[PDB]
Design brief:
phosphoprotein, lipid metabolism, globular, ACP-like_sf, fatty acid biosynthesis, monomer, Acyl carrier protein AcpXL, Non-ribosomal Peptide Synthetase Peptidyl Carrier Protein, Chain A
Length: 101
């Protein structure tokens, strides 16, 4: 089953040159993978275009910098993929109550 995480893992793989083998759900971008803000610009931009959603990294970065949130919520790959799953559900929310593919 191709989930939101399957795509995010591929993004970070081809962006940061980090092999898929060393990528895991509970891995943190900054803490574990060693991803810098400048590299994560490219990650969030590739996700923005790939999923076809507006990822506001300007907000997510600000949440951490202003102490309103932690890096865990927006950089751990499963948490990141949960926030992206939120945004793809948001554009899917435009669906008119017809529960069928």
């Amino acid at each position: 089953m191709t989930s939101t995480f399957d795509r995010v893992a591929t993004i970070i793989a081809e962006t940061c040159d980090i092999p898929r083998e060393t990528i895991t759900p509970e891995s943190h971008a900054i803490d574990d993978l060693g991803i810098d803000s400048l590299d994560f610009l490219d990650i969030a931009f590739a996700i923005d275009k790939a999923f076809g959603i507006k990822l506001p990294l300007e907000k997510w970065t600000q949440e951490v910098n202003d102490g309103k949130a932690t890096t865990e919520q927006y950089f751990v790959l499963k948490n990141l993929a949960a926030r992206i799953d939120e945004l793809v559900a948001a554009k899917g929310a435009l669906e008119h109550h017809h529960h069928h593919h």
